[PDB]
Design a binder for this molecule. Structure first.
Ligand SMILES: *[C@@H]1O[C@H](CO)[C@@H](O[C@@H]2O[C@H](CO)[C@@H](O[C@@H]3O[C@H](CO)[C@@H](O)[C@H](O[C@H]4O[C@H](CO)[C@@H](O)[C@H](O)[C@@H]4O[C@H]4O[C@H](CO)[C@@H](O)[C@H](O)[C@@H]4O[C@H]4O[C@H](CO)[C@@H](O)[C@H](O)[C@@H]4O)[C@@H]3O)[C@H](O)[C@H]2NC(C)=O)[C@H](O)[C@H]1NC(C)=O
Ligand SMILES: *[C@@H]1O[C@H](CO)[C@@H](O[C@@H]2O[C@H](CO)[C@@H](O[C@@H]3O[C@H](CO)[C@@H](O)[C@H](O[C@H]4O[C@H](CO)[C@@H](O)[C@H](O)[C@@H]4O[C@H]4O[C@H](CO)[C@@H](O)[C@H](O)[C@@H]4O[C@H]4O[C@H](CO)[C@@H](O)[C@H](O)[C@@H]4O)[C@@H]3O)[C@H](O)[C@H]2NC(C)=O)[C@H](O)[C@H]1NC(C)=O
Ligand SMILES: *[C@@H]1O[C@H](CO)[C@@H](O[C@@H]2O[C@H](CO)[C@@H](O[C@@H]3O[C@H](CO)[C@@H](O)[C@H](O[C@H]4O[C@H](CO)[C@@H](O)[C@H](O)[C@@H]4O[C@H]4O[C@H](CO)[C@@H](O)[C@H](O)[C@@H]4O[C@H]4O[C@H](CO)[C@@H](O)[C@H](O)[C@@H]4O)[C@@H]3O)[C@H](O)[C@H]2NC(C)=O)[C@H](O)[C@H]1NC(C)=O
Ligand SMILES: *[C@@H]1O[C@H](CO)[C@@H](O[C@@H]2O[C@H](CO)[C@@H](O[C@@H]3O[C@H](CO)[C@@H](O)[C@H](O[C@H]4O[C@H](CO)[C@@H](O)[C@H](O)[C@@H]4O[C@H]4O[C@H](CO)[C@@H](O)[C@H](O)[C@@H]4O[C@H]4O[C@H](CO)[C@@H](O)[C@H](O)[C@@H]4O)[C@@H]3O)[C@H](O)[C@H]2NC(C)=O)[C@H](O)[C@H]1NC(C)=O
Ligand SMILES: *[C@@H]1O[C@H](CO)[C@@H](O)[C@H](O)[C@H]1NC(C)=O
Ligand SMILES: *[C@@H]1O[C@H](CO)[C@@H](O)[C@H](O)[C@H]1NC(C)=O
Ligand SMILES: *[C@@H]1O[C@H](CO)[C@@H](O)[C@H](O)[C@H]1NC(C)=O
Ligand SMILES: *[C@@H]1O[C@H](CO)[C@@H](O)[C@H](O)[C@H]1NC(C)=O
Ligand SMILES: [Ca+2]
Ligand SMILES: [Ca+2]
Ligand SMILES: [Ca+2]
Ligand SMILES: [Ca+2]
Lengths: 388, 388, 388, 388
């Protein structure tokens, strides 16, 4: 077994093709399925796995009541092969109300945060054993990516934040070797608030597109130098911005450098990736709510401030259906590294009627160099058919 | 590991012996089991797997209502070891309302079609990653075999159709290497309508027996030259024809060349294979409905037009019981390549109105050079005992 | 990997120690568990598996009604790791209302009989593929061991019967190499009726203790010469006889040669094995019904006609509780071959009329050279707590 | 594969970080989950497993009624990967109402005790086969650790007791090689009553911290010399004692040598381990009941009699929530051997009378050389939401 280097060029991308869907909520109405949120996907060299934060209960279960809450002690990281729904045989990998996972070519690293809001613990589990832990540095909800970390040549990197969700916070980039923290770098650059980074290998370095929860509806970028541990940060150049909420395309802005101060407060986890001067990105179709999901390329969207010429739009989830968090993962092919993404399809309380639970399913798409058509792949559950 | 070549002679066939049965619908009445249709079987070098298109729901589940519909975004390809029923731990391999799968000796290829009727996408997944995709070419339900594809020396072939189900359509034969489409050939020859091909290795080439949904109740043949990608097509010579609907045995015809224009409209997926001048074939026992299932050899049925001398009949499913789609798969033995088949046993709507769902179980038989008796192996569920 | 030879001495045996129990029926009252009967155990070189004939239904399921019947088309052979109860993820290995399985050191052989009573088919599946089949030779319920077959140096042997259960029948011993029948020997010797043999390796040969359903309450022995395929048969010498029904211990007889003509009609599958002049055997505690289970050694019980000197009695299931079929399996240790056995614990109809189903659990014990105490390990389900 | 030697220094310990939680009871209210008690954790060289004694039933099952009883024939040892809850696919490894398991680097050993109170049998199963057995030596509930045994250089050791729970008993230390008992040593030293030992490798020897059920609320130590099989015993020096019940912290004593005669009767399984002159230990927060769980270091707690200076306290389960048994396990890291522990979280009768069953979930923590915060990770089930 060799460490992954991800040392191939990025695949040609013309858009995205359907990859996986789990139908979690539909199945929940006729079977014992975990209540989850904050899912993601990560692949070992051979196969892909779906992850999510359980709520310590199945859906058709009185304990599913009031699972809207983000942090309870019973949350655990679930891990199944991609497309295997979270049934009762699912392994709970660690205790976590915030997580990141990645495979270095040899073994899995899991970063699992749990405990009190003001004094959380992050556990670092590698190759099936606890190797390290760190306590809260800002005493205000130590937290991490909710998507895959990235490892190059045996060094894995993960972005963590501690502090205010509505002001200056303390973001740190950890470097981890076989589960052991070997270095911690403070966030540097012009990103002013960084949450829930979606990171990808860009050999020899790592690049993250994140969520600004404070003043930006444009998405921050964090660049991680894997050689010298230096950090840089800015914002996606695209004038078509990626956060929710955001201004309408009529009036939205990004200058590549600063939070745009356009409905900056709050946000949603999302992703983008560069191809030369262009950017491929996803966002909710609604500028207001976590409804619908679309992808497109913005011509000059990586390099030209305020660029707004999009092309190659695809609807993933139509605007009449719920989405949620989304994130990137990378898959090594024969000659190139492909970029894929998942969309969390949130169902239940409070937005929807009848039910007392909050859960999600997932849909997953992967970059293609080929051709494709159109469709919409929403959660598909009928709220009227669900146990409450 | 080496690529499969299937470079052994076809096994001696005296008939077929029982191989597998999943009892899906019986189990559905007391357990959480997927609603499915369009099942098939395919084996890696070591063991066989059962596949089917899920309906994104279990049977004992309000979402099972109105699962008669062929295409919804929630359909996914399920894959279990043969004889493991589709329980909640089943892996959903891809998003698909039409599919084909095969193993090349090294890894699995899945061809998965989903999306809008007028603009579908086929994804090509190999060794657990998306390698290619193609969009609809005729804007009219791009679709494929619903049974195993065939790979020789690292090149896999699959037949796909796009266009009318009741007139001239656009059928293409794809050649795929490690998930990448390397060549596409148009259908050629005298077959006038080709659907749902059941294909098998006939080293060094591939041979398919398909469904003519337009003018033929005789089954089309598609011959695929794996060296130069050339295509030929015609019809099974046997005067005992394989489609449903069809004329009675007394008045049925085939001239090997043309659709017989005998109750040609509509059809059912099925199979046949050659042994010299003779043909082994299955069909529904009913000439009108998907009821019963029988196999037999037609003497001269491969090479003599309108041959009707049958022998070695076996009842697989008696005529009082429901069948459905059927297809071929091939299994490599020590010295020869064996031919096996599965039968889909459809239950529920529209025919059975006590329940609101549509699903199936499977029964599977394999070629034998030995001896055997008689029986009948239907679905076996009591419709009155079923959750509705 | 090498073929198993079983070429080690039989382990020292002082009695039996508890090995496994599945609690199938207790679990059935709170979970989806297969209805079964005719279970057995067989181990590959690494680990042991439990097998049984499913009834194509779970217990808490309307299809469980009237599962008293021995032969329906929906019966399939189930196979799990030993101690894993027959849940919905259990693999159905083949279609079978009578079966035998064994591992030759390289792969599994399964002998699976199904179809019409007067014209059954036995399928021979090896290394995951159908290799051979045979039809009924006496047109009267072709049938086999319901316990493990035995393979030495790549040749597996299995005993099959076709014909009357209450008169002269046609018993044959098959020799099978990688799934292919290479020789068939007729029964020879003085055993007059042979059913449901429990066989074990006695290098270089195989020895079976069976059920005489006709005139004997003493158990037949079948000796299989693996070199020249010759067959011999007689009866266990022990005056303490192993069948049910039987006479009481005071009046029972065996002359080693002939059926004893003591309540000879009917019987139950069981086992015994030799150690020099002595025999280790199990039997139901009741002489009338399949109630209770005991093991003991009979001193001179292998070599001395009508020997009744028992020692080392152990209660496996107390006489207040139901038993059923029992059979032998063999397990290779470091320096010796151990003998183990399972007991089928039958619940439901016809004896227990509150419920409409018939099913079983299992308990398993293995030979020990050590020491042990006493107990009773019955099924343990409360019939009043069961779904009916 | 090589035998484990555990020949690395003990890892630096600053405290404990969260590792695993199974949420068994919460899940039981919406899924088929085993009723258990007496859980533990043990890891092979790659992966950790959770074990527990089943009650031969699921929770939502009428058979769960009156599972307070410790010993029934239906109890079996369950084994899943750590964090996989005990679903219906769980393997029952052996018949056991008392158990210990460990991996020697090559294979699993299981020590499983079952049968009559006055005449129990312990089975020794290694590498999937029964290798040895021993009967009761004191005719009074032969019993063992309820946590992992320890193997060094292919020799595994386990502590067993037979005799009174409230007076002088007969404790023996067994030495087992590939499942075969090679030596038995009587308890020696000043420990006067030894139950339910929590043992760990301290190369080249093994050290156990146990439960005195008779005169001590201070915990006994058993030291096992793996070279000459000699045994020593005493009591943990710490004046902060580990048993429940016990005196309050102000009035509790230990002299390292004798049971303290302070509320000595009864107890609970627990653990401690040495670091130089200091001791790391866990205990219930309540001095009266199995409620809450805390860990801390006692400075001089290993070497100084009646030492009471604690530091590095952590709450694992707050005092408002139920705990139960706890035990140690050891995990080999790159350069050191880590110490971890599990806590049994008991729910139901007799304390909670709304329900009729008794079961548990688990939470698991591992030693860390890093930093951590605070929290509480109780069972989390709402008794009012449970099937009774
Ligand atoms: C079968 O499947 C294939 C493959 O999926 C389909 O082909 C794809 O079809 C897509 C839709 O036509 C196409 O993407 C489009 O590319 C064009 C550039 O050629 C781009 O303009 C499109 O983006 C606009 O339209 C979409 C809706 O389609 C809007 O959501 C989006 O916001 C864009 O609209 C904005 O810009 C327009 C142009 O300036 C304005 O006219 C419009 O009012 C709107 O303006 C707002 O935003 C501006 C900033 O962007 C701002 O200045 C202004 O003030 C407003 O605020 C879209 O990306 C794919 O390229 C194509 N794929 C391929 C490979 O060919 C095919 O159609 C399917 N066929 C069927 C029958 O199903
Ligand atoms: C135990 O098990 C074994 C193994 O399963 C059994 O042996 C098998 O038995 C099969 C049935 O006899 C046998 O297959 C038959 O082979 C003969 C040739 O030898 C063939 O004629 C049979 O086909 C006719 O009969 C079946 C029903 O059995 C019909 O479904 C079929 O359509 C055929 O009937 C048509 O042709 C006949 C002859 O011309 C006409 O009499 C009949 O009316 C009908 O005519 C219509 O169709 C014609 C076109 O074909 C058309 O010209 C006309 O106008 C009408 O429309 C069948 O294939 C197996 O070979 C044999 N297997 C082996 C290895 O021996 C055994 O019986 C079992 N034993 C018991 C006691 O259960
Ligand atoms: C703790 O556990 C250990 C290990 O499990 C226990 O030790 C075991 O204890 C067993 C019972 O004592 C013992 O087996 C016995 O061995 C003697 C020979 O030494 C043998 O005679 C015993 O067999 C008789 O008794 C059993 C009931 O125990 C009957 O079921 C059986 O049919 C036998 O009864 C017949 O023979 C008797 C003597 O000849 C007659 O009195 C009786 O009426 C009956 O006669 C009928 O059968 C005859 C043919 O057999 C026939 O001629 C006559 O006309 C009648 O029809 C039994 O096998 C184990 O050897 C021993 N194990 C070890 C390793 O020591 C220990 O007791 C446990 N302790 C506690 C307190 O739980
Ligand atoms: C964020 O998380 C971090 C990491 O978890 C937190 O840091 C940890 O904080 C712990 C609590 O302060 C600390 O452990 C403590 O260490 C001190 C020594 O420095 C030790 O004295 C503490 O033990 C006492 O207090 C705990 C409750 O905290 C009691 O349960 C315990 O019994 C001890 O109290 C007894 O002794 C005291 C002093 O002698 C008495 O005042 C008290 O009444 C009580 O006396 C009884 O027992 C005596 C025998 O011991 C007996 O003589 C007398 O008669 C009475 O019966 C505790 O171990 C950790 O070291 C620290 N961890 C690290 C790595 O720094 C941090 O606080 C969190 N952040 C925030 C803001 O909360
Ligand atoms: C959920 O819990 C709330 C109490 O917070 C209660 O009012 C409501 O009835 C519960 N829902 C159900 C379905 O029991
Ligand atoms: C299925 O849906 C139809 C149309 O809404 C309805 O009439 C029928 O009652 C439904 N079936 C069940 C069993 O709910
Ligand atoms: C089982 O079937 C019999 C015969 O049809 C019937 O009398 C009985 O009520 C059935 N049992 C149940 C529980 O439905
Ligand atoms: C449990 O058994 C007891 C004694 O038979 C009975 O009083 C009680 O009702 C049972 N509990 C349930 C929930 O059936
Ligand atoms: Ca924002
Ligand atoms: Ca047709
Ligand atoms: Ca008899
Ligand atoms: Ca005590």
């Amino acid at each position: 077994v060799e460490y992954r280097n991800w040392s191939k060029p990025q695949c040609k991308i013309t858009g995205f093709a359907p990859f996986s869907k789990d139908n979690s909520i539909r199945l929940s109405a006729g079977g014992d399925i975990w209540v989850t949120r904050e899912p993601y996907v990560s692949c070992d060299p051979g196969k892909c796995y779906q992850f999510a934060l359980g709520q310590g209960t199945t859906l058709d279960n009185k304990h599913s009541n009031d699972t809207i809450h983000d942090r309870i002690p019973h949350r655990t990281l679930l891990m199944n092969e991609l497309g295997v729904p979270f049934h009762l045989g699912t392994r709970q990998v660690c205790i976590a109300w915030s997580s990141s996972s990645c495979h270095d070519g040899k073994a899995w690293l899991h970063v699992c945060v749990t405990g009190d809001d003001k004094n959380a613990t992050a556990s670092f589990i590698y190759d099936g054993r606890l190797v390290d832990s760190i306590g809260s540095w800002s005493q205000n909800i130590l937290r991490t990516q909710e998507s895959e970390c990235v490892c190059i040549n045996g060094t894995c990197t993960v972005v963590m934040t501690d502090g205010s969700a509505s002001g200056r916070a303390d973001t740190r980039i950890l470097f981890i070797e076989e589960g052991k923290i070997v270095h911690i770098s403070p966030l540097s650059g012009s990103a002013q608030h960084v949450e829930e980074c979606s990171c990808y290998p860009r050999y020899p370095d790592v690049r993250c597109i994140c969520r600004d929860n404070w003043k930006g509806s444009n998405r921050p970028i964090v660049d991680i130098n894997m050689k010298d541990y230096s950090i840089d940060s800015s914002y996606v150049c695209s004038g078509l911005v990626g956060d929710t909420p955001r201004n309408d395309d009529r009036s939205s802005k990004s200058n590549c450098r600063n939070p745009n101060n356009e409905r900056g407060n709050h946000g949603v986890k999302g992703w983008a990736f560069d191809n030369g001067n262009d950017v491929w990105m996803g966002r909710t179709i609604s500028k207001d709510l976590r409804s619908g999901y679309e992808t497109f390329k913005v011509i000059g969207g990586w390099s030209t401030p305020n660029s707004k010429s999009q092309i190659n739009r695809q609807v993933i989830v139509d605007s009449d259906n719920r989405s949620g968090y989304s994130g990137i993962f990378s898959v090594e092919g024969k000659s190139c590294i492909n970029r894929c993404f998942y969309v969390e399809l949130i169902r239940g309380r409070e937005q929807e009627t009848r039910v007392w639970w909050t859960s999600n399913s997932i849909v997953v798409f992967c970059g293609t160099s080929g051709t494709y058509g159109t469709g919409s792949w929403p959660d598909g559950a009928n709220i009227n058919f669900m146990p409450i």
